[PDB]
Amino acid sequence: HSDLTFCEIILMEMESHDAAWPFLEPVNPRLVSGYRRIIKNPMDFSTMRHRLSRGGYTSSEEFAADALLVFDNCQTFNEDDSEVGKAGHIMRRFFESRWEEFY
Ligand SMILES: CCc1c(-c2csc(N3CCNC[C@@H]3C(=O)NCCc3ccno3)n2)[nH]c(C)c1C(C)=O
Ligand SMILES: [Mg+2]
Numbered sequence: 001h002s003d004l005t006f007c008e009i010i011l012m013e014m015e016s017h018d019a020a021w022p023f024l025e026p027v028n029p030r031l032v033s034g035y036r037r038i039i040k041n042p043m044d045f046s047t048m049r050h051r052l053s054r055g056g057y058t059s060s061e062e063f064a065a066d067a068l069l070v071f072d073n074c075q076t077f078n079e080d081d082s083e084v085g086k087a088g089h090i091m092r093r094f095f096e097s098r099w100e101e102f103y
Contacts, residue, residue, distance in 0.1 A: 003060035004060070007052060007060055010067075010095065010099065010102075011049060013094075014067075014094065014095060015049070017090075017091060019091050020091060021087065022088065023045045023088070025046055026044050026046070026047065027039070034077075038076065038077055039076065039077055041069060041073070042073065043069040044070060048063070048066050048067070048070075068095075071088055071092035074088035074092075075092075
């Protein structure tokens with residue numbers, strides 16, 4: 001319960017972050033050639049929000065696993081100097097820095 005309220009705060013803060021715009025919704029593979037082929041386990045903030053809403057996270061470590069997946073997928077598919085890659089580095093650094101000043 002302490003673990004979960006922290007996840008609510010971090011997710012709320014990532015959802016409203018300026019650099020969150022690539023990660024608010026699932027990537028549409030119909031619009032992104034090669035995405036289905038390369039990214040085996042898609043993840044985004046709204047899927048995390050839904051899982052948290054239905055109580056599908058048992059511990060904060062599962063939440064952090066999903067967050068890290070978002071940024072791992074991002075760095076796998078996008079160039080570091082791409083518009084999406086640049087936002088993903090800002091969001092990843094934000095998440096890591098928020099996570100550790102809680103744990
Ligand atoms: C690069 C695609 C991507 C996004 C993402 C979400 S909105 C968005 N933008 C919309 C405005 N114009 C620039 C860019 C874009 O090209 N949208 C069309 C493709 C699309 C939209 C939604 N789904 O596909 N980009 N987020 C991640 C993690 C991505 C990848 C490839 O990893
Ligand atoms: Mg990692």
